[PDB]
Amino acid sequence: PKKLKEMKXXXXXXXXXXXXXXXXXXXXXXXXXXXXXXXXXXXXXXXXXXXXXXXXXXXXXXXXXXXXXXXXXXXXXXXXXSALRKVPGYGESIRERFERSLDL
Amino acid sequence: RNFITRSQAVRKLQVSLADFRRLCIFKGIYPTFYYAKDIQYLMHEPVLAKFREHKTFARKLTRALGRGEVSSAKRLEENRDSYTLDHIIKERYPSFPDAIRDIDDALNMLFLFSNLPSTNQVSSKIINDAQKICNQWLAYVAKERLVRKVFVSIKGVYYQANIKGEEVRWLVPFKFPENIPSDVDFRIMLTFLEFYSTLLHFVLYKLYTDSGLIYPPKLDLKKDKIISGLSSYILESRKYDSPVASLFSAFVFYVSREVPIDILEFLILSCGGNVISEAAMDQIMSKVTHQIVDRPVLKNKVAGRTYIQPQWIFDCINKGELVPANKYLPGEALPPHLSPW
Amino acid sequence: XXXXXXXXXXXXXXXXXXXXXXXXXXXXXXXXXXKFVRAESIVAKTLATSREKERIKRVSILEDKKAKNETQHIASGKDFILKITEGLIREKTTYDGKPALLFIVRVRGPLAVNIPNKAFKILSLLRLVETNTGVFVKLTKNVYPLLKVIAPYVVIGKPSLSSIRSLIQKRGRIIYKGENEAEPHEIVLNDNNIVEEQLGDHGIICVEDIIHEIATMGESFSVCNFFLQPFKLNREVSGFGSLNRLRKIKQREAESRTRQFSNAATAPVIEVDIDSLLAKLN
Amino acid sequence: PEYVRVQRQKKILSIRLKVPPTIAQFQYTLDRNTAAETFKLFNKYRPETAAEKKERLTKEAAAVAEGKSKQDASPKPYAVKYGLNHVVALIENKKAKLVLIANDVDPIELVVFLPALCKKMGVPYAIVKGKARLGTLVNQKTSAVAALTEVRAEDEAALAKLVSTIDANFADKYDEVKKHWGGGILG
RNA sequence: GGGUUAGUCGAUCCUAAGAGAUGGGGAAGCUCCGUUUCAAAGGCCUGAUUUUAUGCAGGCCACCAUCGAAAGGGAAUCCGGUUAAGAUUCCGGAACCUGG
């Protein structure tokens, strides 16, 4: 059994270690719904570093919060970026992940 | 026959419904209206068998506890098979660039779980594996020093990496204690987590072996005690694309204790320059030319040392080129940065 | 898209009802029936009070002899620090006459003990009630006699600045005076301007520097004790149920190995590596 | 169903009719704390499982396989005794210091002599409630009997006071009502 | 030797008087009683059922196999032509029904 534990200690590393990817073979699946991330090319559209436009989100802040959460979150996405010193700490991001998971 | 009720399929498969939710996400099986032939494909699967075996295993564990026999329960737990995820990863993504195409969502969750604090529902071991794999992923980037794009935001830090084809758009939220949402259920994101973890695990295998160095990355423990980052890992053995890789070559920084050390550290590692932070120093300055700092009043005010607010690094890499630092000198105001998107 | 609004209202309502009923049931029923108590625990706790009160008595005797320096009849003149690491090694080093950083960890206390008022005073001045609260503290010689008293209820050690960093950047509450509140409220560490607002006098900004000067302790450390005053850790095991009861048994065996109870009043201070420990509790 | 109907109609037809006094000694059984301490006693004396047995066998066999013949020393195994003929076999020597007797056995007649037999042999028997709880402490499904003979010196003083406890709680309380015809009251 | 060609004419499907397995109960037994009866007699909806982090949870519905009509009930086709012997069934044209 000491030799058995010696075997298992090496085999635990050797099993997770080895891997293989393969060559080009496409999966033409009609039911599969693969979509890229939205707002990936809209990062200048977010103010996000001391930019002007999100001050309009200051005017429509009550308009954003009055809306539904699906309409509130994208409207409250842009906000007044002050400086390096503060980042508000991401309440929305976990909900965004969970919403994306529900979309999948 | 095209649409099958979730109750019908879950009773034909004889699986619990939450594990059916695992398997659909897990194999990418999509619609309470489901394809009959996809369920026929799902109808034989050894991971389903090992799930049912785990149900019976937990039942034998309950009788082991109810009889109070601790040692047999220890024997059951030790002599226990683990379902792996790896085969449907390979038969789901045979072509490795398809894994490179679909690593993009896989990174993002694991980075968010690496940010996340320890809870009851999410184990620390989960978070430990997340932070380990994410630090490995960052440490691989600083080898080839190949990203190009930088984005500063209230929502995240979006970097896309120009590696073996597509630029890959991974994001890290800042290392802040987050109020946990009671609205979410972890039971889905843990399945995504484990799937992406194993998938990115073997993709890191091919990227480390393809880059020719050892897939387990060694770290000095006392270097990790300085800082838990990509810079903890040493990377073994067994040019750079111009200009962004080896931008700021031979360049010595002095990041302050004031600055956020993490993403600036990673950017300097994407440059190849050095990192010197006094925050690392008080754990326990000849060549330092440049201070990244964001403070109104600078104390020692060395004219030899260049005083710069960090957007210079965020703007130089988004251009790939050098810009003047008069705007980045404290306390001069800054151009409203709109990233190249 | 209707499932979003519907289950979003449902989960918030059921979660608030579950948390409120869990708050309104636990202290209510255990004082309502409150029990047909037992005949055994009432005696075993009485013996446990005798043991714990007597060892704190002997601690107070021997520490008054060391402190008044009327020392002729004691066991050991200097104190000692034991070091439990990995069939488990325990390294003993003599005491250091030097201030230091410690991260104490409030452990669940031993089995069935009613704890006295002298230990309760020291724990209450250190805010360690409601366990899974590891808090930062200063090693000197005058704070040290408390460490003999709290040792059967906490664990001691040297944490790493990366681990301290991850503690502070992942966990931490601030009791805060804000815009418009009844103001028992605690915010997690997001705003550095909130930090420099209350700590502009000491000149403490940008919570990275709070990590740095908890590490430093050269200018101000107890100001961080006033500001980052609350702390919370998670419970490490999922607990009830078969797959986690084995984990509970194995970790109770681990805790019975790592914690040693001295009761001698010449009790060495026991340090454990918090660095591997915060791979569990953070 | 039929089987639910019969298992509910069972224990009605029993109590409705006069049970003989050699039965209904059962369910005049041990109370809560004394059975609890009896189980705390016998879990100190669990027998070895087949896995633990085979494990120790592999340890000593690998020792002799190296050889590395370490020593020749082992005091004795002490455990509960649980085979029914073996339990009866430990009586009529006598060797049984304590006997636990399950109340519920479907062939009751396997068991019915044991209280009178330990009565005449003077063995401190006690009627326990539930043979499954006997099987749990002996790594069986059920056991229906539980004899215990050999005790370490650490536990021998606990043994004697448990014997006195049982003889106070069982032999004094239920002895006269043991003679009486139980049941007979309709349902 | 040749000859009887159908989505639309029938059978098939439905139930009638009646027959008759099953669950059960009688009988030494061949078998007899009984037909929805003293049966656990299936198939539908929802589910991040929110935490125990790799084991099904919360509900809804309520009688009963089958056989029994070429005259009872019942989707839908007509004209003209043609063969030694066939046609509302083949040929030509013109219609309708059911399901997708």
GROMACS .gro file of N, CA, C and O in nm, chain D residues 37-103:
model
  268
  764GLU      N    1  -2.600   0.548   2.709
  764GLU     CA    2  -2.468   0.521   2.764
  764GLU      C    3  -2.423   0.380   2.731
  764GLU      O    4  -2.303   0.353   2.719
  765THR      N    5  -2.519   0.289   2.712
  765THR     CA    6  -2.485   0.155   2.668
  765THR      C    7  -2.430   0.156   2.526
  765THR      O    8  -2.333   0.085   2.495
  766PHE      N    9  -2.486   0.240   2.441
  766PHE     CA   10  -2.434   0.254   2.306
  766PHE      C   11  -2.301   0.326   2.305
  766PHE      O   12  -2.213   0.293   2.225
  767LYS      N   13  -2.283   0.424   2.394
  767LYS     CA   14  -2.153   0.488   2.409
  767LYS      C   15  -2.048   0.389   2.455
  767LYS      O   16  -1.931   0.399   2.419
  768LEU      N   17  -2.090   0.293   2.537
  768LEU     CA   18  -2.000   0.186   2.577
  768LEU      C   19  -1.965   0.097   2.458
  768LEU      O   20  -1.847   0.067   2.435
  769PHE      N   21  -2.065   0.053   2.383
  769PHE     CA   22  -2.038  -0.051   2.284
  769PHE      C   23  -1.973   0.007   2.159
  769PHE      O   24  -1.908  -0.066   2.083
  770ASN      N   25  -1.988   0.137   2.135
  770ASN     CA   26  -1.913   0.198   2.026
  770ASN      C   27  -1.766   0.214   2.061
  770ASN      O   28  -1.683   0.234   1.972
  771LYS      N   29  -1.732   0.206   2.189
  771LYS     CA   30  -1.591   0.194   2.223
  771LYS      C   31  -1.539   0.057   2.186
  771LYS      O   32  -1.420   0.041   2.159
  772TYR      N   33  -1.627  -0.043   2.182
  772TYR     CA   34  -1.589  -0.180   2.152
  772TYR      C   35  -1.649  -0.229   2.022
  772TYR      O   36  -1.703  -0.340   2.017
  773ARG      N   37  -1.643  -0.147   1.918
  773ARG     CA   38  -1.683  -0.190   1.785
  773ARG      C   39  -1.590  -0.302   1.738
  773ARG      O   40  -1.470  -0.297   1.763
  774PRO      N   41  -1.643  -0.403   1.670
  774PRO     CA   42  -1.555  -0.501   1.608
  774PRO      C   43  -1.492  -0.442   1.484
  774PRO      O   44  -1.534  -0.340   1.431
  775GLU      N   45  -1.388  -0.510   1.437
  775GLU     CA   46  -1.314  -0.464   1.322
  775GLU      C   47  -1.394  -0.493   1.196
  775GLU      O   48  -1.459  -0.597   1.186
  776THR      N   49  -1.392  -0.401   1.100
  776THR     CA   50  -1.464  -0.426   0.976
  776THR      C   51  -1.380  -0.516   0.888
  776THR      O   52  -1.264  -0.541   0.919
  777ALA      N   53  -1.438  -0.563   0.778
  777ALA     CA   54  -1.363  -0.645   0.683
  777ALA      C   55  -1.255  -0.562   0.614
  777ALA      O   56  -1.146  -0.612   0.586
  778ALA      N   57  -1.284  -0.434   0.589
  778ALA     CA   58  -1.187  -0.346   0.527
  778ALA      C   59  -1.070  -0.318   0.620
  778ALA      O   60  -0.954  -0.325   0.579
  779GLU      N   61  -1.099  -0.288   0.747
  779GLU     CA   62  -0.994  -0.262   0.845
  779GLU      C   63  -0.912  -0.387   0.872
  779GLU      O   64  -0.790  -0.380   0.889
  780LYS      N   65  -0.980  -0.502   0.876
  780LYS     CA   66  -0.913  -0.630   0.890
  780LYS      C   67  -0.815  -0.654   0.777
  780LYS      O   68  -0.696  -0.673   0.802
  781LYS      N   69  -0.864  -0.647   0.654
  781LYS     CA   70  -0.782  -0.670   0.536
  781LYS      C   71  -0.670  -0.568   0.526
  781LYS      O   72  -0.559  -0.600   0.482
  782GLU      N   73  -0.695  -0.446   0.572
  782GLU     CA   74  -0.593  -0.342   0.571
  782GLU      C   75  -0.479  -0.375   0.667
  782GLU      O   76  -0.361  -0.364   0.629
  783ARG      N   77  -0.512  -0.415   0.790
  783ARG     CA   78  -0.408  -0.454   0.885
  783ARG      C   79  -0.334  -0.578   0.836
  783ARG      O   80  -0.212  -0.592   0.857
  784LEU      N   81  -0.407  -0.669   0.770
  784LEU     CA   82  -0.345  -0.787   0.712
  784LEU      C   83  -0.244  -0.750   0.605
  784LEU      O   84  -0.135  -0.806   0.601
  785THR      N   85  -0.279  -0.654   0.520
  785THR     CA   86  -0.186  -0.610   0.417
  785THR      C   87  -0.066  -0.540   0.476
  785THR      O   88   0.046  -0.554   0.426
  786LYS      N   89  -0.086  -0.465   0.585
  786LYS     CA   90   0.026  -0.399   0.653
  786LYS      C   91   0.126  -0.500   0.707
  786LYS      O   92   0.246  -0.493   0.677
  787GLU      N   93   0.077  -0.597   0.784
  787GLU     CA   94   0.167  -0.694   0.844
  787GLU      C   95   0.224  -0.789   0.740
  787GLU      O   96   0.336  -0.838   0.754
  788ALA      N   97   0.150  -0.811   0.632
  788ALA     CA   98   0.200  -0.899   0.527
  788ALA      C   99   0.307  -0.831   0.445
  788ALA      O  100   0.403  -0.895   0.403
  789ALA      N  101   0.294  -0.700   0.422
  789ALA     CA  102   0.402  -0.627   0.356
  789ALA      C  103   0.523  -0.617   0.447
  789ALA      O  104   0.637  -0.614   0.399
  790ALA      N  105   0.500  -0.612   0.579
  790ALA     CA  106   0.609  -0.617   0.674
  790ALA      C  107   0.686  -0.748   0.664
  790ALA      O  108   0.810  -0.747   0.656
  791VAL      N  109   0.616  -0.861   0.662
  791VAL     CA  110   0.683  -0.990   0.651
  791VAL      C  111   0.740  -1.009   0.511
  791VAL      O  112   0.843  -1.075   0.493
  792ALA      N  113   0.680  -0.945   0.411
  792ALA     CA  114   0.730  -0.952   0.274
  792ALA      C  115   0.864  -0.882   0.262
  792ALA      O  116   0.955  -0.931   0.195
  793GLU      N  117   0.878  -0.766   0.326
  793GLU     CA  118   1.012  -0.712   0.346
  793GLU      C  119   1.090  -0.799   0.443
  793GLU      O  120   1.203  -0.839   0.413
  794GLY      N  121   1.030  -0.831   0.557
  794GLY     CA  122   1.091  -0.918   0.656
  794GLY      C  123   1.221  -0.869   0.717
  794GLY      O  124   1.323  -0.928   0.682
  795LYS      N  125   1.228  -0.766   0.804
  795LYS     CA  126   1.127  -0.678   0.867
  795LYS      C  127   1.013  -0.755   0.938
  795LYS      O  128   0.895  -0.720   0.933
  796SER      N  129   1.052  -0.864   1.004
  796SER     CA  130   0.966  -0.930   1.103
  796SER      C  131   0.980  -0.848   1.230
  796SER      O  132   1.076  -0.866   1.306
  797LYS      N  133   0.887  -0.755   1.249
  797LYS     CA  134   0.896  -0.644   1.345
  797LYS      C  135   0.902  -0.701   1.487
  797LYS      O  136   1.007  -0.689   1.552
  798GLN      N  137   0.796  -0.764   1.538
  798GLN     CA  138   0.801  -0.832   1.666
  798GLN      C  139   0.694  -0.940   1.662
  798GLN      O  140   0.629  -0.957   1.559
  799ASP      N  141   0.673  -1.013   1.771
  799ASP     CA  142   0.557  -1.100   1.784
  799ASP      C  143   0.482  -1.059   1.909
  799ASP      O  144   0.502  -1.119   2.016
  800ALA      N  145   0.397  -0.958   1.897
  800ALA     CA  146   0.327  -0.905   2.013
  800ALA      C  147   0.195  -0.840   1.975
  800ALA      O  148   0.191  -0.753   1.888
  801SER      N  149   0.088  -0.883   2.041
  801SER     CA  150  -0.044  -0.822   2.035
  801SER      C  151  -0.121  -0.876   2.154
  801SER      O  152  -0.117  -0.997   2.179
  802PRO      N  153  -0.187  -0.789   2.231
  802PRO     CA  154  -0.249  -0.836   2.356
  802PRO      C  155  -0.362  -0.934   2.336
  802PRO      O  156  -0.348  -1.050   2.372
  803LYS      N  157  -0.469  -0.891   2.270
  803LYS     CA  158  -0.590  -0.960   2.225
  803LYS      C  159  -0.674  -0.859   2.151
  803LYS      O  160  -0.666  -0.739   2.178
  804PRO      N  161  -0.756  -0.901   2.059
  804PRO     CA  162  -0.867  -0.816   2.017
  804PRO      C  163  -0.978  -0.821   2.120
  804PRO      O  164  -1.012  -0.929   2.169
  805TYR      N  165  -1.033  -0.706   2.158
  805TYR     CA  166  -1.157  -0.702   2.235
  805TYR      C  167  -1.265  -0.644   2.147
  805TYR      O  168  -1.244  -0.540   2.083
  806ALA      N  169  -1.381  -0.709   2.145
  806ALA     CA  170  -1.493  -0.656   2.069
  806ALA      C  171  -1.621  -0.709   2.131
  806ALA      O  172  -1.620  -0.794   2.220
  807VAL      N  173  -1.733  -0.657   2.081
  807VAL     CA  174  -1.862  -0.715   2.113
  807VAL      C  175  -1.875  -0.850   2.045
  807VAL      O  176  -1.806  -0.879   1.947
  808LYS      N  177  -1.964  -0.932   2.096
  808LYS     CA  178  -1.993  -1.061   2.036
  808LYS      C  179  -2.140  -1.065   1.997
  808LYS      O  180  -2.225  -1.018   2.073
  809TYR      N  181  -2.167  -1.118   1.879
  809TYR     CA  182  -2.291  -1.087   1.809
  809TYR      C  183  -2.354  -1.206   1.739
  809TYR      O  184  -2.469  -1.196   1.697
  810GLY      N  185  -2.280  -1.315   1.720
  810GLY     CA  186  -2.341  -1.433   1.665
  810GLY      C  187  -2.433  -1.492   1.769
  810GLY      O  188  -2.395  -1.503   1.886
  811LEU      N  189  -2.554  -1.528   1.728
  811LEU     CA  190  -2.657  -1.569   1.823
  811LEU      C  191  -2.620  -1.698   1.894
  811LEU      O  192  -2.629  -1.707   2.017
  812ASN      N  193  -2.581  -1.800   1.818
  812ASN     CA  194  -2.531  -1.922   1.879
  812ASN      C  195  -2.403  -1.895   1.954
  812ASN      O  196  -2.376  -1.955   2.058
  813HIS      N  197  -2.324  -1.800   1.905
  813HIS     CA  198  -2.204  -1.757   1.976
  813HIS      C  199  -2.240  -1.683   2.105
  813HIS      O  200  -2.171  -1.698   2.206
  814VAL      N  201  -2.347  -1.603   2.103
  814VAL     CA  202  -2.392  -1.535   2.225
  814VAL      C  203  -2.439  -1.635   2.329
  814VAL      O  204  -2.399  -1.628   2.446
  815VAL      N  205  -2.520  -1.732   2.287
  815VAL     CA  206  -2.564  -1.839   2.376
  815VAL      C  207  -2.445  -1.921   2.422
  815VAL      O  208  -2.436  -1.965   2.537
  816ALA      N  209  -2.347  -1.937   2.333
  816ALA     CA  210  -2.226  -2.011   2.362
  816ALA      C  211  -2.142  -1.941   2.467
  816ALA      O  212  -2.069  -2.006   2.542
  817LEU      N  213  -2.147  -1.808   2.472
  817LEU     CA  214  -2.073  -1.736   2.574
  817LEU      C  215  -2.144  -1.741   2.708
  817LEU      O  216  -2.081  -1.726   2.813
  818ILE      N  217  -2.275  -1.762   2.706
  818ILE     CA  218  -2.341  -1.804   2.827
  818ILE      C  219  -2.316  -1.954   2.842
  818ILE      O  220  -2.258  -2.017   2.752
  819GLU      N  221  -2.352  -2.010   2.958
  819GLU     CA  222  -2.326  -2.148   2.997
  819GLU      C  223  -2.177  -2.175   3.001
  819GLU      O  224  -2.131  -2.285   2.971
  820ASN      N  225  -2.100  -2.070   3.032
  820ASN     CA  226  -1.964  -2.087   3.079
  820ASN      C  227  -1.943  -2.034   3.222
  820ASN      O  228  -1.873  -2.100   3.299
  821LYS      N  229  -1.997  -1.917   3.262
  821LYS     CA  230  -2.052  -1.802   3.189
  821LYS      C  231  -1.939  -1.710   3.149
  821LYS      O  232  -1.834  -1.706   3.213
  822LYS      N  233  -1.957  -1.639   3.039
  822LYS     CA  234  -1.859  -1.541   2.996
  822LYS      C  235  -1.921  -1.407   2.966
  822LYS      O  236  -1.851  -1.306   2.964
  823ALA      N  237  -2.052  -1.403   2.946
  823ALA     CA  238  -2.121  -1.281   2.909
  823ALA      C  239  -2.130  -1.189   3.029
  823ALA      O  240  -2.195  -1.221   3.129
  824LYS      N  241  -2.062  -1.075   3.020
  824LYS     CA  242  -2.074  -0.975   3.124
  824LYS      C  243  -2.198  -0.890   3.104
  824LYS      O  244  -2.267  -0.858   3.201
  825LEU      N  245  -2.227  -0.854   2.980
  825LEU     CA  246  -2.353  -0.790   2.945
  825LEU      C  247  -2.406  -0.849   2.816
  825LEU      O  248  -2.329  -0.885   2.725
  826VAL      N  249  -2.537  -0.859   2.809
  826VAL     CA  250  -2.609  -0.904   2.691
  826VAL      C  251  -2.714  -0.800   2.659
  826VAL      O  252  -2.789  -0.759   2.748
  827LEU      N  253  -2.717  -0.755   2.535
  827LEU     CA  254  -2.828  -0.678   2.484
  827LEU      C  255  -2.914  -0.767   2.396
  827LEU      O  256  -2.862  -0.846   2.316
  828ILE      N  257  -3.045  -0.753   2.412
  828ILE     CA  258  -3.144  -0.836   2.346
  828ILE      C  259  -3.240  -0.745   2.272
  828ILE      O  260  -3.302  -0.657   2.332
  829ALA      N  261  -3.251  -0.766   2.141
  829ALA     CA  262  -3.343  -0.685   2.062
  829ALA      C  263  -3.487  -0.726   2.090
  829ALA      O  264  -3.518  -0.844   2.105
  830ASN      N  265  -3.575  -0.627   2.099
  830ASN     CA  266  -3.715  -0.656   2.121
  830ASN      C  267  -3.780  -0.714   1.996
  830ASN      O  268  -3.859  -0.808   2.004
   0.00000   0.00000   0.00000
